[PDB]
Design a protein around this ligand. Sequence first.
Ligand SMILES: [Mg+2]
Ligand SMILES: [Mg+2]
Ligand SMILES: [Mg+2]
Ligand SMILES: [Mg+2]
Ligand SMILES: [Mg+2]
Ligand SMILES: [Mg+2]
Ligand SMILES: [Mg+2]
Ligand SMILES: [Mg+2]
Ligand SMILES: [Mg+2]
Ligand SMILES: [Mg+2]
Ligand SMILES: [Mg+2]
Ligand SMILES: [Mg+2]
Ligand SMILES: [Mg+2]
Ligand SMILES: [Mg+2]
Ligand SMILES: [Mg+2]
Ligand SMILES: [Mg+2]
Ligand SMILES: [Mg+2]
Ligand SMILES: [Mg+2]
Ligand SMILES: [Mg+2]
Ligand SMILES: [Mg+2]
Ligand SMILES: [Mg+2]
Ligand SMILES: [Mg+2]
Ligand SMILES: [Mg+2]
Ligand SMILES: [Mg+2]
Ligand SMILES: [Mg+2]
Ligand SMILES: [Mg+2]
Ligand SMILES: [Mg+2]
Ligand SMILES: [Mg+2]
Ligand SMILES: [Mg+2]
Ligand SMILES: [Mg+2]
Ligand SMILES: [Mg+2]
Ligand SMILES: [Mg+2]
Ligand SMILES: [Mg+2]
Ligand SMILES: [Mg+2]
Ligand SMILES: [Mg+2]
Ligand SMILES: [Mg+2]
Ligand SMILES: [Mg+2]
Ligand SMILES: [Mg+2]
Ligand SMILES: [Mg+2]
Ligand SMILES: [Mg+2]
Ligand SMILES: [Mg+2]
Ligand SMILES: [Mg+2]
Ligand SMILES: [Mg+2]
Ligand SMILES: [Mg+2]
Ligand SMILES: [Mg+2]
Ligand SMILES: [Mg+2]
Ligand SMILES: [Mg+2]
Ligand SMILES: [Mg+2]
Ligand SMILES: [Zn+2]
Lengths: 135, 77, 252, 112, 91
Amino acid sequence: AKFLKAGKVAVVVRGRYAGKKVVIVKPHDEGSKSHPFGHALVAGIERYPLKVTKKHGAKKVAKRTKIKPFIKVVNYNHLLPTRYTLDVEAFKSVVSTETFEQPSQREEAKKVVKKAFEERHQAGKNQWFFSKLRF
Amino acid sequence: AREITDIKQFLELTRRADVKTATVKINKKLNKAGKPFRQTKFKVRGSSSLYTLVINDAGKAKKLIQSLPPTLKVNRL
Amino acid sequence: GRVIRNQRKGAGSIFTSHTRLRQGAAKLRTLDYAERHGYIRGIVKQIVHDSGRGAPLAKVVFRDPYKYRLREEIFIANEGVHTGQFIYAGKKASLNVGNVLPLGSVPEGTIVSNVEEKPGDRGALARASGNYVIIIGHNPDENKTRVRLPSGAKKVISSDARGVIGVIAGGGRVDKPLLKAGRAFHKYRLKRNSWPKTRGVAMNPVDHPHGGGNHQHIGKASTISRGAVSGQKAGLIAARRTGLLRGSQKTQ
Amino acid sequence: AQRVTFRRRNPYNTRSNKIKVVKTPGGILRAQHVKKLATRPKCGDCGSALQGISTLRPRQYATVSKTHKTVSRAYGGSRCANCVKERIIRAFLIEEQKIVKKVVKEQTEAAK
Amino acid sequence: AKRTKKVGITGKYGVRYGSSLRRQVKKLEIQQHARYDCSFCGKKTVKRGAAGIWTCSCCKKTVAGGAYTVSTAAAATVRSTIRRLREMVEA
RNA sequence: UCUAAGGGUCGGGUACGAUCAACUUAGAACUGGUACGGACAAGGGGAAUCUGACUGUCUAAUUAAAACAUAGCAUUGCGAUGGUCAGAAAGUGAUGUUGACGCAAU
RNA sequence: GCUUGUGACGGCCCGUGAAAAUCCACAGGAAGGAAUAGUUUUCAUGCCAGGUCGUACUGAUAACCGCAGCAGGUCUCCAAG
RNA sequence: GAUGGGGAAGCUCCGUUUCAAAGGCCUGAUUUUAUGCAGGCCACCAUCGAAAGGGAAUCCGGUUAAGAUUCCGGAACCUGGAUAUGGAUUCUUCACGGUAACGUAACUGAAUGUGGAGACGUCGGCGCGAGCCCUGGGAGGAGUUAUCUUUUCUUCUUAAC
Ligand SMILES: [Mg+2]
Ligand SMILES: [Mg+2]
Ligand SMILES: [Mg+2]
Ligand SMILES: [Mg+2]
Ligand SMILES: [Mg+2]
Ligand SMILES: [Mg+2]
Ligand SMILES: [Mg+2]
Ligand SMILES: [Mg+2]
Ligand SMILES: [Mg+2]
Ligand SMILES: [Mg+2]
Ligand SMILES: [Mg+2]
Ligand SMILES: [Mg+2]
Ligand SMILES: [Mg+2]
Ligand SMILES: [Mg+2]
Ligand SMILES: [Mg+2]
Ligand SMILES: [Mg+2]
Ligand SMILES: [Mg+2]
Ligand SMILES: [Mg+2]
Ligand SMILES: [Mg+2]
Ligand SMILES: [Mg+2]
Ligand SMILES: [Mg+2]
Ligand SMILES: [Mg+2]
Ligand SMILES: [Mg+2]
Ligand SMILES: [Mg+2]
Ligand SMILES: [Mg+2]
Ligand SMILES: [Mg+2]
Ligand SMILES: [Mg+2]
Ligand SMILES: [Mg+2]
Ligand SMILES: [Mg+2]
Ligand SMILES: [Mg+2]
Ligand SMILES: [Mg+2]
Ligand SMILES: [Mg+2]
Ligand SMILES: [Mg+2]
Ligand SMILES: [Mg+2]
Ligand SMILES: [Mg+2]
Ligand SMILES: [Mg+2]
Ligand SMILES: [Mg+2]
Ligand SMILES: [Mg+2]
Ligand SMILES: [Mg+2]
Ligand SMILES: [Mg+2]
Ligand SMILES: [Mg+2]
Ligand SMILES: [Mg+2]
Ligand SMILES: [Mg+2]
Ligand SMILES: [Mg+2]
Ligand SMILES: [Mg+2]
Ligand SMILES: [Mg+2]
Ligand SMILES: [Mg+2]
Ligand SMILES: [Mg+2]
Ligand SMILES: [Zn+2]
């Protein structure tokens, strides 16, 4: 199917965020006046939670498991679409066109997405997604 | 070595803890195609390099010279 | 008279190998635990000319089983092996050009190269360009394997002795006329100091058994005994026949 | 007509004794000695001069800020982007195909 | 306009060395300088670079080959021999 | 002393114009005490015999050669516990970062 | 135009044409680190110090070697009409 | 070319990482105290050998009877060591931007690993830079002038950073 849709996981394959795993939250299958190409709007993760162990005490766990997120407009030809897929309801509105344009609106966006990702991460949903692709 | 063009930044220089000595040079120079005019270079000698600001307008020139710190040991020409 | 040329050679003063540009010695992997129980994989990372040698070298790199690092090796490239190729080495390796396997694990008819004379000696047999050895039999009790060297000689070595599947690269190098003195010049310039060659029959008696006389000539049989002495051995040493070889050679 | 002399004792024309002729403010010709040309850094994977990265002689790199030595991607100043597309793609599929092989021979170990 | 009735590339040797040697050289010269097909990517762009080494301009694979030609008859038969012999070992 | 051929840069709706800068080559007049690559600079040629194929090399200071070398041809030894060679000896050494498409010896 | 530099290429090899000190980068993520205030000297500016030996001149039909102020010999850069 | 060694009557010969128990760094442990032990590494095992190879950083003007990239003037740059102030970063802790190639004044990073640079033949044509050569105008100085020549010669330069 038009497999690039509502919650497709993908690996960013060029740019700063290359190799990091994202979620498509809103696809633009064809065109923009700006961005004149098939592109998706993604919520990636920039700094993965570092592995955690039994030796890891109270707050060391707290620290280890903080995620730095990111939001990106990105060309289709720069994603590798993944079979895995992750639910996108808590930050559907957060990530949008209007979200980009004006920094302050971006920083707000990531705040939410960040909260959403750390909720998700604990009680290990989507286990794959919170794990550095290594190359 | 360096050249400076922000009039504001220049006054900031002229008061830096090491800036002891400075100089004003005057150059007769010609304008566009026709006549000549009076160029004036402000050179502050900071510790590790010599900053120089070219005020091209004889007007701004005069007033700038008044603002010169009254302890700076300016060399006129 | 004088010490003749072929005796002076041995003190290797002006006669040592010209070595500066060489890639390093060509050698199989040290026979560790991987290669003798399983296999271990490498990538040929570069195949490369080695001065003075005729066959190109393969630079092949493997992971280190006991430490986090790469360990690189210098192979001699068999024909057809290529950069980015995976090279498999060990008892339980599979039978393709480029891999290295113990002669015990290959059927007779197998065509190998750089084979060891004893297991672990990291390769000795058939390394020159174009050369190979054929496995022509096995004796599973007292695990020996019997092979035929490029010389024609048949020999039996341990079945754990290793070799690499295929033939060495650069074949037919010698099919092509050197044409001029100069090409030999550069040939030996990168090898050792054996060129050119004065005939002993052109020297004076001081210099050689062949030297002197008012016409050029050897004056005695040039087939010299094995038991001859230094200073004496010039010409056809230990020659069991002599003269133009008529009729087909080839070891029956 | 104005000719010129070396300025160090070395009289020979070696790689480390390159010369460039220059007109001084005195209005005369004078030799200047010239350091060898820097070559461009190259890619670990392919070998092409890698873009983004300043080219200096090696010790001249410790005199220069961190941003003359990288691009802001994974494997920045080290591999050449296209070479890193390849890395990501290849990584992914192989880690995927590994999941595949396991579950296939898991079925072989249960049906045989 | 045909420049030479028969020496071809070998005309560079003038009259020297003897026609026979020049013949032999001619054959292997033509071999070694030739452009060959690349197995991996399919463009005819494999040129030699020192005896035994054969590299592809595009795509950049290098293959150990013959002194003067990419594949050697001996090599080739050996290849299929190994094909054949290995065949028995899974079969 | 003339003629001819060989070029650059520009604006042209979605056929040419205007300009600046180079010796090259060929042809035609005229002209002189028939001279003119005017000094300088700059291959003698031909027909054969002997002999070494060639380029290369040597007797510094009486021999440069037809002598030596060479590519080419051919023979010999040797699979490493080896061939050839070094050393008074040795847990010594050259070939050897080598392996018969190789090393050594004619 | 001349000399020199340099680039993108092309020819050539049974010849494919050093090494090490040293400098940087990346992969890694041990660790360290903020809100009543922390992190940062690969950004800027600022402060102090840099020892030891050689340094004259000739380099050649007179400063070197040939018994010598010897028509010999002795490595090299710059190069006008 | 020393050293554990092995030969040699011995002067000494061999070997150079070798049949050797071959050593030193980073910080933590001290708040009797000055440096004992606690980790984990790293097993690389001398040293001499280039005034043409490799290689951190300087230029112009002036100056002496005779020195000068070395003195003087002025303007820089490197290496080591000290460090404060500003800036940047952070309540989403370890920067944002660009689809991307990648941008930047900054933008933490031990062990370990890996990559680059240092680092490399020769010839040929072609392209470009520099200095030199040729040359117009102009502003100057000189020369020639019976006659002729808006003429002949010359000055009009710009370092590292
Ligand atoms: Mg040696
Ligand atoms: Mg010789
Ligand atoms: Mg001979
Ligand atoms: Mg001979
Ligand atoms: Mg004689
Ligand atoms: Mg005799
Ligand atoms: Mg005899
Ligand atoms: Mg005789
Ligand atoms: Mg004879
Ligand atoms: Mg000097
Ligand atoms: Mg040169
Ligand atoms: Mg840059
Ligand atoms: Mg950069
Ligand atoms: Mg990182
Ligand atoms: Mg015309
Ligand atoms: Mg015209
Ligand atoms: Mg006769
Ligand atoms: Mg001759
Ligand atoms: Mg001759
Ligand atoms: Mg003589
Ligand atoms: Mg004599
Ligand atoms: Mg002669
Ligand atoms: Mg003579
Ligand atoms: Mg013959
Ligand atoms: Mg002994
Ligand atoms: Mg020259
Ligand atoms: Mg090359
Ligand atoms: Mg670098
Ligand atoms: Mg710890
Ligand atoms: Mg700094
Ligand atoms: Mg001097
Ligand atoms: Mg003199
Ligand atoms: Mg003399
Ligand atoms: Mg010794
Ligand atoms: Mg030294
Ligand atoms: Mg030096
Ligand atoms: Mg040097
Ligand atoms: Mg001076
Ligand atoms: Mg003085
Ligand atoms: Mg002087
Ligand atoms: Mg000074
Ligand atoms: Mg100063
Ligand atoms: Mg400093
Ligand atoms: Mg910023
Ligand atoms: Mg390195
Ligand atoms: Mg390298
Ligand atoms: Mg070099
Ligand atoms: Mg400089
Ligand atoms: Zn290809």
